[PDB]
């Protein structure tokens, strides 16, 4: 970006009680945050998230609350936000690398783990169980979004009609979403605390596939549990999804007979959810990417 120097970053961090070496890497793929991998003067590795624009205070305080809450309930590491202002978010680096990363240029998937690892399935299922176990009372106490079963279909109906109007959508994708909305028996009669964007990019694991951490908690709220399975089906396939649901159930994960079906519809609905995102932001580059996934390109 060249928007700020290492000295500018050292000054920001020092102002929040963090003294940084001049050894820094950048990740500029984030639309909301400039990301920095930094070293403090004791050799501790830090992740800095520096907001790209003003107005993100509510977003940052909410994620802070979410991390404080999930920290009490998960066996795996989550970011420990020791700094959290409108100017800077900072946490010490966690134990393991993400399951995959994206090529800086092309956004090609680079697997850090053997995708076929069954230790990924057993450990991911345990984490899913602990996240989904987080009590509603505690969620309400933290002023987080709570979607009830009866809220889900109205909301997605409104998303469909909005995205069709503003971005456009293929006849085949629109009819799949309409059939999904009318297919009552797919929709669970309970909602649970979910990560809200749980896919391999946000899961930290050893090379053998043992999940040790989960990052990027900004989207966490009470909603359709199937949202937390959707990101698995794309990258790992339907057989792997079946193995995961079974492993989840064995732990006492609350399922229904159509969780499988709902997950596939949720995954097939990524282009609609990206439509929504790209539409709020108003970034023209993002709207064009949306059109492509929605099949109007």
Short mmCIF file of C-alpha atoms in Angstrom, two decimals:
data_model
loop_
_atom_site.label_atom_id
_atom_site.label_comp_id
_atom_site.label_asym_id
_atom_site.label_seq_id
_atom_site.Cartn_x
_atom_site.Cartn_y
_atom_site.Cartn_z
CA UNK A 1 0.00 0.00 0.00
CA UNK A 2 2.81 2.46 1.03
CA UNK A 3 0.08 4.33 3.01
CA UNK A 4 2.16 4.04 6.26
CA UNK A 5 5.91 3.47 7.00
CA UNK A 6 7.36 0.99 9.58
CA UNK A 7 8.15 4.10 11.73
CA UNK A 8 4.44 5.20 11.52
CA UNK A 9 3.45 1.65 12.67
CA UNK A 10 6.06 1.61 15.52
CA UNK A 11 4.64 5.02 16.73
CA UNK A 12 0.99 3.79 16.62
CA UNK A 13 1.92 0.58 18.56
CA UNK A 14 4.17 2.42 21.12
CA UNK A 15 1.13 4.75 21.76
CA UNK A 16 -0.86 1.54 22.74
CA UNK A 17 1.97 0.16 24.99
CA UNK A 18 3.52 -2.19 22.35
CA UNK A 19 7.23 -1.64 21.48
CA UNK A 20 8.02 -3.10 18.00
CA UNK A 21 11.28 -4.04 16.23
CA UNK A 22 11.64 -2.88 12.55
CA UNK A 23 11.07 -6.53 11.39
CA UNK A 24 7.59 -6.51 9.73
CA UNK A 25 5.67 -8.51 7.06
CA UNK A 26 2.41 -7.23 5.46
CA UNK A 27 -0.78 -8.95 4.22
CA UNK A 28 -2.86 -6.41 2.14
CA UNK A 29 -5.62 -8.92 1.04
CA UNK A 30 -8.05 -7.68 3.78
CA UNK A 31 -10.61 -5.05 2.61
CA UNK A 32 -11.23 -3.62 6.16
CA UNK A 33 -7.79 -4.12 7.88
CA UNK A 34 -4.13 -3.74 6.86
CA UNK A 35 -2.49 -6.82 8.53
CA UNK A 36 1.11 -6.69 9.96
CA UNK A 37 3.21 -9.58 11.38
CA UNK A 38 5.44 -7.73 13.89
CA UNK A 39 8.08 -8.50 16.58
CA UNK A 40 8.09 -6.76 20.01
CA UNK A 41 11.48 -6.04 21.73
CA UNK A 42 11.23 -9.37 23.76
CA UNK A 43 10.94 -11.47 20.52
CA UNK A 44 7.14 -12.09 20.93
CA UNK A 45 5.42 -12.28 17.49
CA UNK A 46 2.29 -10.05 17.12
CA UNK A 47 -0.51 -9.67 14.57
CA UNK A 48 -1.54 -6.01 14.00
CA UNK A 49 -4.91 -5.20 12.30
CA UNK A 50 -4.91 -1.47 11.29
CA UNK A 51 -8.36 -0.21 10.11
CA UNK A 52 -8.24 1.03 6.44
CA UNK A 53 -10.99 3.69 7.02
CA UNK A 54 -12.71 5.55 9.93
CA UNK A 55 -16.08 4.36 11.39
CA UNK A 56 -15.21 0.75 12.46
CA UNK A 57 -15.36 1.32 16.29
CA UNK A 58 -18.69 -0.58 16.75
CA UNK A 59 -17.33 -3.53 14.62
CA UNK A 60 -14.06 -3.72 16.68
CA UNK A 61 -15.76 -3.51 20.15
CA UNK A 62 -18.26 -6.26 19.09
CA UNK A 63 -15.44 -8.64 17.97
CA UNK A 64 -13.67 -7.82 21.32
CA UNK A 65 -16.82 -8.92 23.27
CA UNK A 66 -17.18 -12.07 21.06
CA UNK A 67 -13.50 -13.11 21.73
CA UNK A 68 -13.95 -12.55 25.54
CA UNK A 69 -17.10 -14.79 25.45
CA UNK A 70 -15.77 -17.70 23.25
CA UNK A 71 -12.42 -17.77 25.22
CA UNK A 72 -14.51 -19.14 28.20
CA UNK A 73 -16.00 -22.04 26.12
CA UNK A 74 -13.43 -23.35 23.53
CA UNK A 75 -10.55 -25.87 24.02
CA UNK A 76 -8.70 -24.26 21.02
CA UNK A 77 -6.81 -20.91 20.97
CA UNK A 78 -8.59 -17.74 19.70
CA UNK A 79 -6.98 -14.29 19.25
CA UNK A 80 -6.15 -12.65 22.63
CA UNK A 81 -6.87 -8.95 21.78
CA UNK A 82 -4.50 -7.21 24.25
CA UNK A 83 -4.95 -3.95 22.18
CA UNK A 84 -8.39 -2.92 20.72
CA UNK A 85 -8.97 0.80 19.83
CA UNK A 86 -10.29 2.43 16.58
CA UNK A 87 -6.58 3.02 15.61
CA UNK A 88 -5.13 -0.48 16.27
CA UNK A 89 -6.02 -4.11 17.07
CA UNK A 90 -3.10 -6.38 18.19
CA UNK A 91 -2.80 -9.97 19.48
CA UNK A 92 0.16 -12.35 20.01
CA UNK A 93 0.55 -14.84 17.09
CA UNK A 94 -1.20 -18.22 17.73
CA UNK A 95 0.53 -21.67 17.66
CA UNK A 96 -0.40 -23.00 14.15
CA UNK A 97 -0.78 -21.76 10.51
CA UNK A 98 -4.21 -21.66 8.81
CA UNK A 99 -5.30 -24.94 7.07
CA UNK A 100 -4.88 -23.09 3.70
CA UNK A 101 -3.63 -19.66 2.50
CA UNK A 102 -4.34 -17.70 -0.73
CA UNK A 103 -1.64 -16.74 -3.31
CA UNK A 104 -1.13 -12.92 -2.99
CA UNK A 105 -1.58 -12.34 -6.81
CA UNK A 106 -4.14 -14.99 -8.01
CA UNK A 107 -6.06 -16.07 -4.77
CA UNK A 108 -5.21 -19.73 -5.66
CA UNK A 109 -5.70 -22.15 -2.71
CA UNK A 110 -2.37 -23.20 -1.09
CA UNK A 111 -2.98 -26.20 1.26
CA UNK A 112 -0.70 -26.16 4.41
CA UNK A 113 -2.42 -29.44 5.56
CA UNK A 114 -3.27 -32.75 3.76
CA UNK A 115 -7.01 -32.05 3.08
CA UNK A 116 -7.84 -35.83 3.31
CA UNK A 117 -6.58 -35.91 7.00
CA UNK A 118 -9.30 -37.56 9.20
CA UNK A 119 -7.75 -35.82 12.31
CA UNK A 120 -9.10 -32.54 10.75
CA UNK A 121 -12.65 -34.09 10.73
CA UNK A 122 -12.51 -35.37 14.38
CA UNK A 123 -10.90 -32.13 15.79
CA UNK A 124 -13.10 -29.74 13.69
CA UNK A 125 -16.24 -31.62 14.95
CA UNK A 126 -15.12 -31.10 18.61
CA UNK A 127 -14.61 -27.31 18.00
CA UNK A 128 -18.03 -27.06 16.17
CA UNK A 129 -19.62 -28.80 19.24
CA UNK A 130 -18.04 -26.34 21.78
CA UNK A 131 -18.95 -23.18 19.69
CA UNK A 132 -22.58 -24.39 19.20
CA UNK A 133 -22.84 -25.18 22.99
CA UNK A 134 -22.31 -21.50 24.00
CA UNK A 135 -25.44 -20.57 26.01
CA UNK A 136 -28.01 -18.04 24.61
CA UNK A 137 -28.13 -16.15 28.00
CA UNK A 138 -24.38 -15.27 27.65
CA UNK A 139 -24.90 -14.26 23.96
CA UNK A 140 -27.82 -11.90 24.95
CA UNK A 141 -25.59 -10.42 27.77
CA UNK A 142 -23.02 -9.40 25.07
CA UNK A 143 -25.57 -7.50 22.82
CA UNK A 144 -24.94 -9.89 19.84
CA UNK A 145 -27.37 -10.59 16.92
CA UNK A 146 -29.83 -13.43 17.72
CA UNK A 147 -31.74 -14.89 14.75
CA UNK A 148 -34.67 -17.16 15.73
CA UNK A 149 -35.79 -20.06 13.48
CA UNK A 150 -38.78 -17.92 12.19
CA UNK A 151 -36.43 -14.99 11.21
CA UNK A 152 -34.30 -17.01 8.73
CA UNK A 153 -36.52 -17.40 5.62
CA UNK A 154 -37.90 -13.79 5.64
CA UNK A 155 -34.26 -12.45 5.86
CA UNK A 156 -32.98 -14.63 2.95
CA UNK A 157 -36.14 -13.77 0.86
CA UNK A 158 -35.24 -10.05 1.33
CA UNK A 159 -31.53 -10.81 0.48
CA UNK A 160 -32.57 -12.62 -2.78
CA UNK A 161 -34.95 -9.83 -3.96
CA UNK A 162 -32.34 -7.11 -3.09
CA UNK A 163 -29.41 -8.93 -4.86
CA UNK A 164 -31.62 -9.74 -7.94
CA UNK A 165 -32.57 -6.00 -8.15
CA UNK A 166 -29.09 -4.41 -7.63
CA UNK A 167 -26.54 -7.05 -8.94
CA UNK A 168 -28.66 -9.56 -10.96
CA UNK A 169 -28.79 -13.42 -10.74
CA UNK A 170 -29.11 -16.31 -13.27
CA UNK A 171 -32.51 -18.04 -13.65
CA UNK A 172 -30.91 -21.35 -12.48
CA UNK A 173 -29.42 -19.87 -9.25
CA UNK A 174 -32.63 -17.84 -8.48
CA UNK A 175 -34.95 -20.93 -8.82
CA UNK A 176 -32.57 -23.06 -6.64
CA UNK A 177 -32.80 -20.35 -3.88
CA UNK A 178 -36.65 -20.08 -4.28
CA UNK A 179 -37.01 -23.93 -4.02
CA UNK A 180 -34.67 -23.85 -0.94
CA UNK A 181 -36.86 -21.11 0.69
CA UNK A 182 -40.11 -23.16 0.08
CA UNK A 183 -38.52 -26.48 1.28
CA UNK A 184 -39.74 -26.14 4.96
CA UNK A 185 -38.40 -29.53 6.21
CA UNK A 186 -34.72 -28.41 5.52
CA UNK A 187 -34.96 -25.51 8.06
CA UNK A 188 -34.12 -26.51 11.71
CA UNK A 189 -36.59 -25.31 14.43
CA UNK A 190 -33.63 -24.10 16.64
CA UNK A 191 -30.69 -21.67 16.21
CA UNK A 192 -27.32 -21.82 18.05
CA UNK A 193 -24.20 -19.66 18.55
CA UNK A 194 -22.10 -19.94 15.31
CA UNK A 195 -18.70 -18.57 14.17
CA UNK A 196 -20.61 -17.33 11.05
CA UNK A 197 -17.66 -17.66 8.55
CA UNK A 198 -16.07 -21.02 9.47
CA UNK A 199 -13.96 -22.48 6.63
CA UNK A 200 -10.35 -23.82 6.42
CA UNK A 201 -8.98 -20.23 5.93
CA UNK A 202 -10.03 -19.35 9.53
CA UNK A 203 -9.05 -22.72 11.16
CA UNK A 204 -5.48 -23.16 12.59
CA UNK A 205 -4.13 -26.76 12.53
CA UNK A 206 -0.83 -28.74 12.66
CA UNK A 207 0.30 -30.41 9.36
CA UNK A 208 -1.30 -33.74 10.57
CA UNK A 209 -4.72 -31.91 10.72
CA UNK A 210 -5.12 -31.38 14.52
CA UNK A 211 -7.21 -28.16 14.88
CA UNK A 212 -5.53 -25.94 17.55
CA UNK A 213 -7.13 -22.51 16.84
CA UNK A 214 -9.91 -20.48 15.13
CA UNK A 215 -9.49 -16.81 13.96
CA UNK A 216 -11.69 -14.03 12.41
CA UNK A 217 -14.69 -13.97 14.85
CA UNK A 218 -16.37 -10.66 13.61
CA UNK A 219 -19.43 -12.56 12.20
CA UNK A 220 -20.24 -14.67 15.35
CA UNK A 221 -23.98 -14.66 16.38
CA UNK A 222 -26.95 -17.06 16.97
CA UNK A 223 -28.22 -18.46 13.63
CA UNK A 224 -28.62 -21.60 11.45
CA UNK A 225 -25.95 -24.11 12.60
CA UNK A 226 -25.69 -25.22 8.89
CA UNK A 227 -23.81 -21.89 8.19
CA UNK A 228 -20.80 -23.35 10.16
CA UNK A 229 -20.84 -26.56 7.97
CA UNK A 230 -21.30 -24.79 4.54
CA UNK A 231 -17.60 -23.80 4.11
CA UNK A 232 -16.49 -27.47 4.58
CA UNK A 233 -18.50 -28.84 1.59
CA UNK A 234 -16.94 -26.58 -1.13
CA UNK A 235 -13.27 -27.47 -0.26
CA UNK A 236 -13.59 -31.04 1.21
CA UNK A 237 -16.62 -32.48 -0.72
CA UNK A 238 -19.92 -34.16 0.32
CA UNK A 239 -18.46 -37.51 1.60
CA UNK A 240 -16.23 -35.48 4.00
CA UNK A 241 -19.31 -33.39 5.09
CA UNK A 242 -21.18 -36.69 5.87
CA UNK A 243 -18.19 -37.94 8.02
CA UNK A 244 -18.13 -34.51 9.83
CA UNK A 245 -21.92 -34.48 10.65
CA UNK A 246 -21.57 -38.10 12.03
CA UNK A 247 -18.47 -37.16 14.13
CA UNK A 248 -20.30 -33.98 15.33
CA UNK A 249 -23.39 -36.06 16.30
CA UNK A 250 -21.24 -38.66 18.20
CA UNK A 251 -20.04 -35.77 20.48
CA UNK A 252 -23.72 -34.86 21.20
CA UNK A 253 -23.94 -32.15 18.51
CA UNK A 254 -27.64 -31.20 18.01
CA UNK A 255 -28.51 -32.29 14.41
CA UNK A 256 -31.72 -32.88 12.40
CA UNK A 257 -32.23 -35.31 9.45
CA UNK A 258 -31.89 -32.43 6.85
CA UNK A 259 -28.68 -30.76 8.28
CA UNK A 260 -26.86 -32.37 5.26
CA UNK A 261 -29.44 -30.88 2.78
CA UNK A 262 -29.46 -27.43 4.51
CA UNK A 263 -25.60 -27.30 4.45
CA UNK A 264 -25.55 -27.96 0.62
CA UNK A 265 -28.17 -25.19 0.04
CA UNK A 266 -26.18 -22.81 2.36
CA UNK A 267 -22.95 -23.58 0.36
CA UNK A 268 -24.83 -23.13 -2.98
CA UNK A 269 -25.96 -19.72 -1.52
CA UNK A 270 -22.34 -18.29 -1.09
CA UNK A 271 -22.79 -16.18 -4.28
CA UNK A 272 -25.98 -14.59 -2.75
CA UNK A 273 -24.22 -13.84 0.61
CA UNK A 274 -21.26 -12.34 -1.37
CA UNK A 275 -23.86 -10.36 -3.40
CA UNK A 276 -25.07 -8.86 -0.05
CA UNK A 277 -21.49 -8.08 1.18
CA UNK A 278 -20.35 -6.57 -2.20
CA UNK A 279 -23.62 -4.53 -2.26
CA UNK A 280 -23.24 -2.94 1.25
CA UNK A 281 -19.53 -1.98 0.63
CA UNK A 282 -20.45 -0.29 -2.76
CA UNK A 283 -16.95 -1.23 -4.13
CA UNK A 284 -17.45 -1.62 -7.96
CA UNK A 285 -14.56 -4.20 -8.14
CA UNK A 286 -16.49 -6.41 -5.62
CA UNK A 287 -19.92 -5.97 -7.42
CA UNK A 288 -18.31 -7.30 -10.69
CA UNK A 289 -16.90 -10.37 -8.81
CA UNK A 290 -20.45 -10.93 -7.40
CA UNK A 291 -22.14 -10.82 -10.88
CA UNK A 292 -19.67 -13.59 -11.98
CA UNK A 293 -20.56 -15.96 -9.07
CA UNK A 294 -24.30 -15.07 -9.53
CA UNK A 295 -23.96 -16.16 -13.21
CA UNK A 296 -24.78 -12.80 -14.96
CA UNK A 297 -21.15 -12.95 -16.34
#
